[PDB]
Structure formats: structure tokens, C-alpha cells
Amino acid sequence: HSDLTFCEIILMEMESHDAAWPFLEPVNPRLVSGYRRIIKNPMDFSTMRERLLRGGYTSSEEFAADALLVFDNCQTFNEDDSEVGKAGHIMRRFFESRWEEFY
Numbered sequence: 001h002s003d004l005t006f007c008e009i010i011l012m013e014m015e016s017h018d019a020a021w022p023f024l025e026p027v028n029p030r031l032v033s034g035y036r037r038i039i040k041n042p043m044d045f046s047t048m049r050e051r052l053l054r055g056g057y058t059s060s061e062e063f064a065a066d067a068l069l070v071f072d073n074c075q076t077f078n079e080d081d082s083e084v085g086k087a088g089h090i091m092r093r094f095f096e097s098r099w100e101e102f103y
């Protein structure tokens with residue numbers, strides 16, 4: 001149980017983070033030229049939240065893979081000095097730090 005209890009804590013903390021604004025909703029491929037072609041597996045916090053709320057995470061490791069996918073996608077599509085990239089680096093360091101705090 002407490003495995004998925006912490007996932008809720010960490011997800012809510014990412015959701016409310018100052019740097020979370022790029023990752024709150026799915027990227028809109030109609031607005032982001034090239035996104036569909038380059039990113040094979042989109043992921044974002046609201047999709048993780050939908051999946052966490054109706055039970056679809058078997059372990060904490062499934063949840064972490066989705067979190068890391070958000071930031072791997074961010075680094076694949078966005079330059080490191082771009083505004084989305086800088087936000088994603090903050091969010092990625094936040095997630096890894098908070099996740100290791102725990103396990």
C-alpha cells in the first residue's frame with residue numbers, strides 16, 4: 001500500500017511544483033510541429049494522475065517509469081537551454097531526489 005501512497009505524495013508535489021507547467025497536460029501535436037514524429041510515447045502528469053486514480057499502477061516501479069518518460073521525452077524534444085528544457089531539468093532533478101529520499 002505505502003508504495004502507492006508515496007506515488008500520490010510525489011505526484012501531487014510534482015503537480016504543484018513551480019516548474020511543472022510544461023508537463024501538466026499532454027503536448028498538443030497540432031501546436032508542436034514535429035512532436036508526433038519524434039516522441040513515440042507521450043507522457044504527462046495528468047495522464048499519470050488518471051492512471052494512478054483508477055488503480056492502474058501495479059508497483060512503484062511502473063509509476064517511476066512513467067515519471068522518467070516525461071523527462072526523457074522532454075530532453076529528446078527540447079533543447080537544454082530552452083524554457084521547457086530548463087523546467088524539465090528542474091522537475092527531473094526534483095523527482096529523482098524525492099524518489100531516492102524514500103527508497
Ligand SMILES: Cc1ncccc1N[C@H](C)CS(C)(=O)=O
Nearest residue numbers: 021022023027028031032077084
Ligand atoms: C512538454 C513539452 N514538450 C515539448 C513542447 C512543449 C511542451 N509543453 C507545452 C506546454 C505543451 S503545449 C500546451 O502543447 O504547447
